[PDB]
Design a protein around this ligand. Sequence first.
Ligand SMILES: Nc1nc2c(ncn2[C@@H]2O[C@H](COP(=O)(O)OP(=O)(O)OP(=O)(O)O)[C@@H](O)[C@H]2O)c(=O)[nH]1
Ligand SMILES: Nc1ncnc2c1ncn2[C@@H]1O[C@H](COP(=O)(O)OP(=O)(O)CP(=O)(O)O)[C@@H](O)[C@H]1O
Ligand SMILES: Nc1nc2c(ncn2[C@@H]2O[C@H](COP(=O)(O)OP(=O)(O)O)[C@@H](O)[C@H]2O)c(=O)[nH]1
Ligand SMILES: COc1cc([C@H]2C(C#N)=C(N)Oc3c2ccc(N)c3N)cc(Br)c1OC
Ligand SMILES: [Ca+2]
Ligand SMILES: [Mg+2]
Ligand SMILES: [Mg+2]
Lengths: 424, 437, 309, 53
Amino acid sequence: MREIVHIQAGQCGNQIGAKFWEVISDEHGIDPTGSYHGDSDLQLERINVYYNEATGNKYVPRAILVDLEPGTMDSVRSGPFGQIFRPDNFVFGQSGAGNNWAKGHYTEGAELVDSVLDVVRKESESCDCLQGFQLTHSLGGGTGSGMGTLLISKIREEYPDRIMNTFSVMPSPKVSDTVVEPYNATLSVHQLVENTDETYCIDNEALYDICFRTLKLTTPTYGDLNHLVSATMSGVTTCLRFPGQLNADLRKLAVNMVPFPRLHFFMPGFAPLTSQYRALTVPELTQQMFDSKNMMAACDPRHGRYLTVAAIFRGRMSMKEVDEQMLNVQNKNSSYFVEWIPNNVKTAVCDIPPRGLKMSATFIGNSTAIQELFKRISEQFTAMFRRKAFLHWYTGEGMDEMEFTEAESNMNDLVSEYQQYQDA
Amino acid sequence: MRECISIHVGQAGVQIGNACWELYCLEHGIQPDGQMPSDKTIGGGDDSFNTFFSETGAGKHVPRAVFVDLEPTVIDEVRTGTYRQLFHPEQLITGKEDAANNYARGHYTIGKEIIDLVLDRIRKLADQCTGLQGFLVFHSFGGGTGSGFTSLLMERLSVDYGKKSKLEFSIYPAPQVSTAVVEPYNSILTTHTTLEHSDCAFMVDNEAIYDICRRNLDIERPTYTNLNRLISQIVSSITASLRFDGALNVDLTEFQTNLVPYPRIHFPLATYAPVISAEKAYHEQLSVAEITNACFEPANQMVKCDPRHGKYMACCLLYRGDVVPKDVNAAIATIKTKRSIQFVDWCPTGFKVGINYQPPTVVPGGDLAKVQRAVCMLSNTTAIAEAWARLDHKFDLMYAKRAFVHWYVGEGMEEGEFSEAREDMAALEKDYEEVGV
Amino acid sequence: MYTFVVRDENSSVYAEVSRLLLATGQWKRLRKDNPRFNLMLGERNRLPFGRLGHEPGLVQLVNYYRGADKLCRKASLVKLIKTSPELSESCTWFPESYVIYPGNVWIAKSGILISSEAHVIQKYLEKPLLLEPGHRKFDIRSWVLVDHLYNIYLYREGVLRTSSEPYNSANFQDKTCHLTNHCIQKNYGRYEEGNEMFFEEFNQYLMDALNTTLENSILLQIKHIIRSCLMCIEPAISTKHLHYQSFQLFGFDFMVDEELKVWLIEVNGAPACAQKLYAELCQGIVDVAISSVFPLASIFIKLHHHHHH
Amino acid sequence: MEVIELNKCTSGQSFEVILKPPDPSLEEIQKKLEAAEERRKYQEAELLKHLAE
Ligand SMILES: Nc1nc2c(ncn2[C@@H]2O[C@H](COP(=O)(O)OP(=O)(O)OP(=O)(O)O)[C@@H](O)[C@H]2O)c(=O)[nH]1
Ligand SMILES: Nc1ncnc2c1ncn2[C@@H]1O[C@H](COP(=O)(O)OP(=O)(O)CP(=O)(O)O)[C@@H](O)[C@H]1O
Ligand SMILES: Nc1nc2c(ncn2[C@@H]2O[C@H](COP(=O)(O)OP(=O)(O)O)[C@@H](O)[C@H]2O)c(=O)[nH]1
Ligand SMILES: COc1cc([C@H]2C(C#N)=C(N)Oc3c2ccc(N)c3N)cc(Br)c1OC
Ligand SMILES: [Ca+2]
Ligand SMILES: [Mg+2]
Ligand SMILES: [Mg+2]
């Protein structure tokens, strides 16, 4: 259980996907040409998880780069770390998906999916022990959403026994490309409830609010939102990437976090929220990573209960002080955990801090309060679908209304299922 | 003499294995390369220590050990570590994919595809034995491999060695040093499936050991290394009688006779004293009276429970160091008056005593100070049922909601195996209460 | 903020201890099955002591001593007094009691048979002490609080549970003059309110009719019997060096005979506090047994006597 | 309190002190290991059938 295959699909997928490779490459001491120049040996002990070793002692991300249009992928090559990616692993169409799920999933996307799978297969073949896949994408457009979910379906057919992990950016009217975002996101969630083991809900509403309210940025850009996303992605992959004493993998993440197969949508958290000089104290990190204002999914965790929780502290600190602070919230806020999963909070500590910060915490919560995110997309869906508004973009690609009713129903079902366990 | 085979399953099994074999080698004067200078019979022997070590012509002393882990990272540290020359690679068995803290995946899925191979390496060891006694099996309750693969081996050992004794050293799960949320599930399942296959089981609560390391060794945050060096001392006390000259607990059969009259109720409580910090500048050495008394303090038990609220079926006192019987009896007299040591009506209120004049060996640069005398008590007390109740209650809070069950069913295991395993454990709790009140 | 749970409904005393605890602003009550408490206020039967003291980062207290049942059942009290060297078979302050399983007047109990003909048979006190005017029987009830360090605290307020009918020699079957409970007696309240005389008035009656005080005539013997009983079982039930901690409120029941000798009748493991007194006692429980272990932001006489021999 | 069965040697001594007197077959295992692989293969069939739809 060692190699992870990373897929990044569409504009958002390839943008947050690009940042992640810039951030971890710098943590593992890999340079914009793929040459090691670090100091610590810790930086190479589990490098194999995210990198292939090539000729000349080069490190090549196990990264596949997908888009139906050539634009954003020429931007990745242009961009600061663009030379590190295996060139045979860029796969792109010409016509784009135009924010149309049906085009991603069923027409334009169908034509391209087979040639992405071939690159996936190629990466899977020269893997000593594949743990599975992590995909970066938005649910709000056509390619990341529609073609990303088509790929997930096809990877599961060919690899039923490997783990499927997503970083899934939810759309917000506060960062809106188009009115059809709730449509593309509802169709995409149905796919994600059936065919992923773990999904990190990166809510664009949350990223915006954190940038406006709790960071005093009046006009947040995708650059600002993505800074928070790449910090979270660095955080939640720390234990996959570095030794040790946890030695985590994607299956053990799944077994420990998901008590019911459908309830695998994680509320990620980060502390301290940046865009410092004073390092935070362990109690500050602890209070902040459990605070609403620090979650990357716009949900009130006081409206729900935590089923499971994983926390990763980075820097130099007493594990004793981490333990004490992690038991202090559990023993003084027991109402907001379920009594019927004993010892449901797990803490881990890594000595290597992220770039800039001296100590940081990353939160991963399977909270029933995630329902508020799905209900919000449901309501934006119903407000259009009840007048069949903007459907013709989807019927014109061969979709029926039926398939919209089905995706509406499966998302209201997911919301009830979260409700069930909030009152139990 | 009669040979014993030690099987270490999972990370806990294997790391505890390493500590035990480190200590045995120091106790017997065997070096990391496996040469035993004090041993005058070269290429063989029917000495007591030969029950645990085989011998080669070139004069190497080789543990009668099998190490099994479904993943390689932990047994790889044995292969590349201080005691690499000691073991034969055929004894160190690793898969690739671990059980991901899943009983079902350790038993049914990844189990079925490695059992036949382990049994074969076990059989090669049995074939170098003149008169095999049976097996010492080290494992966690909590790991998918420790739980699931262990219970599969114990079924196949029962079939392939019906005559032979099977003893367990089991690590009972503790939230303070815990891997997975599903340890309760894995713990019940492996108990149910191992119950009828095990003759005597020595449970160590990781909570009890962790606290003994906090309280008595002044370690803020104890590590598996600290825990394992202490556990290996208790394990050595218990197995001393198999590896040295004496007349108490001399073969595996006698462990059952002396400690388990009622065969399902076969979990003896280990109590150990004294545990003294090596950092500790000034230490007044404890007497026989003081260390015997320490055996009835719950804070020194391998499992936290109250022996005052339950009945004894057996009590063995295993002394190491400067101890003579008159001091032992004087101590037992004093303590009878001052304490609540109720036995069952159909058992003699009696202590079986073993003394070995060699004090405990400590690992150099270890945490445990050298002492003039130490003792390990083995009481079969119904009070240990407290550990079953605690574990069973945790199982019930999660199973009531079928939480994580789908992870086990997804490997071919049925829901019913859970209720079945839990009913067996409900029966064991009742067995303990009839006998205990 | 500390945390507690309730698992005893009928408990009037821990109803009030719960109420006082909430109304403090530093104590949240949780649901009955929530494992992360500081204090448990536990059920009368089958209390799961095995589960206590295993929760990391939590010091756990419970309001019962495990094995204190042996002092509280009639069947085991008798057996405890007959088989303990510290309370001998020839113990001066326990009425001769016997166990056979399903002046020579006796009484049987666990429907109460008093005859010479006909559970535990007990020597019945043919000549007890009678309050004038009345020629009528009573029983004294003292509330004792054993904390986590096994300090023994007597509450300075007890109470008499009086009859209201002339006690009778030849008439045994009749149950309102012989037996001086509270439930069987509800001439109800003719002489004193609710059949409940208190320590001030009983100290006065004694001074006027018997010239002695309550301290001298009765309370010295009470303090000896409470001390004898709880120091007997201290080795069995003490939670010193244990992974959880116990306290418990006990109610001791006593009789006074004509020559002013104090006998022990029963020890009550889940006792009911008298209506007027609840306020003071329940605040005491909290001050001494609970705030001692869980500090925030004397109504008790402490029992100890080390005579050197 | 009577000290019985005392045995001495040069490494130590042992004695008893008394205060007061008073498995299924290979067939059945390979059977149920296979019944669970048949439940495991069915579940994976049902999954492929559903992905074909
Ligand atoms: N005392 C002690 N307990 C250990 C040790 N290693 C693991 N444990 C405990 O064992 C349980 C976890 O099981 P492991 O032995 O790590 O798992 P495994 O058998 O390797 O199984 P998988 O990795 O799940 O395939 C937890 O209760 C841990 O606290 C160790 O070296 N010493
Ligand atoms: N040996 C004896 N001599 C005289 N009176 C006795 C007696 N034994 C019992 N009694 C009387 O009967 C009553 C006994 O009540 P008992 O203690 O048997 O049960 P109970 O349920 O009332 C316990 P509690 O009163 O503490 O709630 C007392 O009021 C007492 O006067
Ligand atoms: N956080 C974040 N969101 C993005 C980014 N780019 C686009 N989005 C969002 O993603 C959705 C549009 O999807 P996009 O990835 O551009 O569509 P596709 O390229 O056709 O898959 C909308 O909800 C946008 O607000 C980005 O770089 N970061
Ligand atoms: C603390 O960070 C992570 C935890 C886990 C996952 C896991 C692994 N590997 C272990 N063994 O147990 C848990 C785990 C998660 C939650 C809980 N409650 C538990 N017990 C996986 C990863 Br990846 C972690 O880092 C992100
Ligand atoms: Ca030899
Ligand atoms: Mg766009
Ligand atoms: Mg393991």
